[PDB]
A paper describes a structure:
To our surprise, AtMETTL21D was unable to trimethylate AtCDC48. Since the AtCDC48:PUX1:AtMETTL21D complex did not crystallize, we analyzed the structure of AtMETTL21D to gain insight into its mode of action. The crystal structure showed AtMETTL21D in a premethylation state and crystal packing of AtMETTL21D suggested an automethylation mode with residue Lys56 from one molecule pointing toward the active site of the neighboring molecule. First, it revealed that the lysine residue pointing to the binding pocket was indeed not trimethylated. However, when we probed our AtCDC48 samples with an anti-monomethyl-lysine antibody, we observed that AtMETTL21D monomethylated itself, as well as AtCDC48 in the presence of PUX1. Secondly, the structure revealed a difference in the hydrophobic cage that accommodates the methylated ε-amino group. Instead of a Val-Trp-Tyr cage, the plant enzyme contains a Leu-Trp-Tyr cage. We hypothesized that substitution of valine by the larger leucine residue introduces steric hindrance on the possible methylation level. Subsequently, substitution of leucine with valine in plant AtMETTL21D resulted in gain of trimethylation activity. Therefore, we suggest that the leucine to valine substitution in the hydrophobic cage of A. thaliana METTL21D acts as a switch that shifts the methyltransferase activity from monomethylation to trimethylation.
Numbering used by the authors: 4 to 219
């Protein structure tokens, strides 16, 4: 079971494990909406190559790894993380596609992409990936009320004053939605990226992209 997606004109292959009960063994639609958003906003602004020079990003709950891979393709250095059980598939997908795009574009310089274990809230895991990061990203990592606080605490622990948080999100329970929105509003300055910045094909009304700056 392997999904082939085009990102920045490159055909990538992401292995999946449907034999697994683990949520992260499947590619979720928010990661693809995030990757396609980057492809559309990488010519000018904060995701252009010159503006990403020297920037470091960390992906939380990367699963199969689509979102962090796209960001690394833009020239950002990226540490992609998940729990131990997901890491072998993540490591497989990173290394298989890294060798593909570099053989496809030998002269181009992509950002680095290294896999690390990070259980949300584990201070030892957080210290070990070497924060602070310029970007903290996550796609479809909000779904269960009990995971809101550990994710929040992790994002803050990896952040500094100038850190930007990018969140790909799919609305499910309205109760959880309202708790999540209030939480982000209590901790960040939140903006909701509009439909026009997302690709015409990779856009379902239920998928939202948030971009959040640290609070004053
Ligand atoms: N407490 C926790 N610590 C670290 N990762 C967690 C976690 N709880 C859930 N996750 C991870 O969050 C991911 C949710 S599925 C999202 C996968 C990927 N970002 C995508 O968009 O396709 C899973 O990989 C799961 O392992």
């Amino acid at each position: 079971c392997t999904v082939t997606i085009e990102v920045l004109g490159h055909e990538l292959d992401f292995a999946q494990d449907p034999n697994s009960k683990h949520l992260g063994t499947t590619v979720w639609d928010a990661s693809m909406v995030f990757a396609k958003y980057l492809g559309k906003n990488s010519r000018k602004g904060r995701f252009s190559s010159s503006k990403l020079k020297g920037k470091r990003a960390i992906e939380l709950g990367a699963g199969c790894g689509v979102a962090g891979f796209a960001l690394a393709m833009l020239g950002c250095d990226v540490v992609t993380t998940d729990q131990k059980e997901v890491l072998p598939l993540l490591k497989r997908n990173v290394e298989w596609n890294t060798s593909r795009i570099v053989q496809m574009n030998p002269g181009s310089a992509f950002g680095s992409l290294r896999v690390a274990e990070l259980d949300w809230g584990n201070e030892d895991h957080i210290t070990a990936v070497e924060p602070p990061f310029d970007y903290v990203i996550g796609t479809d990592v909000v779904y269960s009320e009990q995971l809101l606080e550990p994710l929040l605490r992790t994002i803050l622990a990896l952040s500094g004053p100038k850190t930007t948080v990018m969140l790909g999100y799919e609305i499910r329970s309205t109760v959880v939605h309202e708790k999540m929105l209030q939480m982000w509003k209590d901790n960040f300055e939140v903006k909701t990226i509009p439909r026009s910045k997302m690709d015409g094909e990779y856009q379902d009304p239920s998928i939202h992209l948030y971009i959040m700056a640290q609070k004053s």
